Design a protein around this nucleic acid. Sequence first.
DNA 1: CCGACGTCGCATCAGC
DNA 2: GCTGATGCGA
DNA 3: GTCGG
Length: 321
Amino acid sequence: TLNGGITDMLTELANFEKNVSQAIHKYNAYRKAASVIAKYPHKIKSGAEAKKLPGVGTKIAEKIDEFLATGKLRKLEKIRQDDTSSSINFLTRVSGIGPSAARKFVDEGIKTLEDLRKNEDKLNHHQRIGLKYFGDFEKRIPREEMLQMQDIVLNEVKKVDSEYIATVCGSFRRGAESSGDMDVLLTHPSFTSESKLLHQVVEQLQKVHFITDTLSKGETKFMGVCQLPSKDEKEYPHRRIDIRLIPKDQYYCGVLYFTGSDIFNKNMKAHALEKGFTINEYTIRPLGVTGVAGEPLPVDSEKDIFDYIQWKYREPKDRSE
DNA sequence: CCGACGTCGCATCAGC
DNA sequence: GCTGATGCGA
DNA sequence: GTCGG
Ligand SMILES: Nc1ccn([C@H]2C[C@H](O)[C@@H](COP(=O)(O)C(F)(F)P(=O)(O)OP(=O)(O)O)O2)c(=O)n1
Ligand SMILES: [Mg+2]
């Protein structure tokens, strides 16, 4: 809303930095600028006005001015029309093709999906799956399908061993009406910090033809593809699903962290610091009088975490910030 | 001025 | 063959 | 690219 022309511009600049110039920190700077401007509840009229916001500096101020006085950025217009740069940027939309792989492909004349299709031999396993489901991976998932997906996942996990605890986290857990993928956090009492749990779950999901492809799989993280059964109806798009096995004594921290939002974890993180706490994905530890965290504390639900920091439970419904 | 800017699991590469 | 580095996505 | 030490 409000400054979509500006934030589209900035996001576009961000992508070229990451994908073409391989400048991760500029990618991040542009996205911060785009994010702070997106939340600005006013129609921006000058670069100076924008510069007042944290993350918007002299150069972005200048870019805004040019956009506001012409309706575009010369550099961006040039970048878009550059065959090499535009191709490198495009190829990274394929899961598994990052900035480096895109650059190599474009160097050797491989620039479109058709070219990718023509050169399967030059693609690793992940990249082939990314190519296979290029279109599907870019679709969002309606909440109703996410629930249908949740039904299958919770049912099959409990079927393998009823002592598993499984939680669908991510935007879905925050009640969002659509998701980009499904994230499943999994634990089991026989698995602690101190102490084939994941393989067995993946195998069951494959057995009932829910999981269709594997991108990567180790003892704690699975990254793959799944698909709901089809009704005389259109088949469902294939969807990205992740499954993480976490020790029970870190599980609820993990659930918090992987539920988001990113901005919420930000805000909640600093609060821990104020009251002398370093919360990371895994644990919560107290900062001694020097900057020295001690042991991780007991955590046996999300709330235990809120309590250590004298917060009251925020239902995931409102963890947008 | 100049460095920081977030982190990790898995797949694959580079070097030995 | 092994160990550490790099690429990648989240 | 922007920030801050
Ligand atoms: N650079 C990154 C990016 C992400 N993540 C982790 C940390 C996040 O908890 C997790 C998902 O971030 P997400 O990018 O899918 C999102 F924020 F858009 P979400 O709202 O969760 O969308 P959805 O629920 O539909 O998948 O990836 C990370 O660790 N590093
Ligand atoms: Mg996601």
